[PDB]
Amino acid sequence: GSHMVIRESVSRIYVGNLPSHVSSRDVENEFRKYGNILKCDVKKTVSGAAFAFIEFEDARDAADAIKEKDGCDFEGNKLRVEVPFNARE
Q: In the chain, where are the structural domains located?
A: 1-89
Burial of 37 (0-12, 13-18, 19+ CB in 10 A): middle
The enclosing H or E element of 50 equals strand 50-56
Give the number of residues written for the chain.
Answer: 89
- Which structural technique was applied? NMR
CA-closest candidate to residue 15, choices 34, 42, 46, 35: 42
The region that residue 27 occupies, defined by phi over 0 for left and psi between -120 and 50 for alpha, beta otherwise, is alpha
The enclosing H or E element of 34 equals helix 32-34
CA-closest candidate to residue 62, choices 13, 9, 15: 13
Tell me which amino acid residue 29 is.
Answer: N
CA–CA distance, 45 with 37 (Å, rounded to integer): 23
CATH superfamily of 1-89: RRM (RNA recognition motif) domain (3.30.70.330)
Q: Is 71 helix (H, G, I), strand (E, B) or coil?
A: coil
